[PDB]
Structure formats: C-alpha cells, structure tokens
Amino acid sequence: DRKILNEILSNTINELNLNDKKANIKIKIKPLKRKIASISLTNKTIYINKNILPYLSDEEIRFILAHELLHLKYGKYHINEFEEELLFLFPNKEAILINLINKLHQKK
Amino acid sequence: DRKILNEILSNTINELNLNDKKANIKIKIKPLKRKIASISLTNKTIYINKNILPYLSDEEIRFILAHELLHLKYGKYHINEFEEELLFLFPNKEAILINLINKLHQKK
Ligand SMILES: [Zn+2]
Ligand SMILES: [Zn+2]
C-alpha cells in the first residue's frame, strides 16, 4: 500500500510535468485535525490524514495527490490554469469529492 | 452563537415534522477524528466536530442539522424518501458540500 502511494506520487509528478524543477516530494501520513490533505511547498511534503487514509480508493488518492502537487505549479494568480489542469485530469472531480464525503460520513 | 445553534436545531426539528415522536434532541460539540457531524439515534444527540465548527456558515449548519435529523425519519430502506426531503429543503446540497470542503481545505 505504501509502495502504491509512492508509485502514484511518482506517476503524478511525471504527468504534471513537475519532474523538471523539483520531484523531491515526500508523502507523510499523520493525523490532521480539519483537513484530508495538505502540502508544505517549502519542505515539498504532502501530508495525508492518517484517520481518512484507510477509506480512500485509488481514484481518490490520485485526485488528492494531483490537487496538492498542482500548488507547486499554479497559485492564486493562476487559479484558472490550476482548475484547467485539474479538470483535464479529473473532469468528474465534483462527483469524486461528493462520493468521498458521503462514504466517510456513512462509514464507522 | 450557541443560542443560534439551538435555535436552528429547534426550527429544523419543526420543519422536518419531528416535534411529534421525539424533539428531545441535543447538540454536543466535540472533536471528531474523521467526520464533520454525527448522530446517536438512541441518545438523540447530534455531535458536531469542534475543529470544523468555527468555519461553518449559517446555510452549512442548517444543511448539516437537517441531514442528521433526517436519520430519525428515514433509514436505508427509505433512502429515496430521505433524499427527497433533503433536496426539497436544500436543492443546492451538492454546491453546499463542494464549497464547504474547498473552504476547509484553503483555510488555515
Ligand atoms: Zn490543495
Ligand atoms: Zn448524516
């Protein structure tokens, strides 16, 4: 599972053309109080919520990693370029997000 | 704010026609590890995530309380009746949920 996490991370870095400029991105699994995922752009570290991680599907992990890595590419000034890239990879992004929240809400 | 919480709760109980059969519903604010809200149907208690609560708008609290109180009305066997009532109160329920997750993700 941890090997698949780093494999998706490595594939996502290549598809987003980020291998040029950084690629030294790490994934840290820790409990987060109010977020599913976060990223430290200075430490180049993606933090995934330990309490949510067991319940995530392959599509959801891929969506979450692409969303966080895109903060290394485009910021608030290029929000249109950010959403364009995110939508081209995941045009069903709203249904992914809706199904994730529903699943986490029902699952005990 | 706590007075507005109990006032929305009281109004939601009346609009959902739940004042007949129970109405002795309580709201408890506690930190939750993987949920925004939860309900104990036996203890008639709605639990709202302490870490998320400061960031919720009036529409979001109203949506969350109606969603949890509707578990007292309709279960898995009447999922169509559950969604029908939820959609008639909040037909923009998907946009509410999408904007909430985005806001919590951006806010630090
Ligand atoms: Zn993000
Ligand atoms: Zn619910």
Swiss-Prot record, chains A, B:
This is Uncharacterized protein MJ1213. Transmembrane segments: none annotated. It comes from Methanocaldococcus jannaschii (strain ATCC 43067 / DSM 2661 / JAL-1 / JCM 10045 / NBRC 100440). InterPro entries: Peptidase_M56 (IPR008756). To M.jannaschii MJ0123 and A.aeolicus AA15.
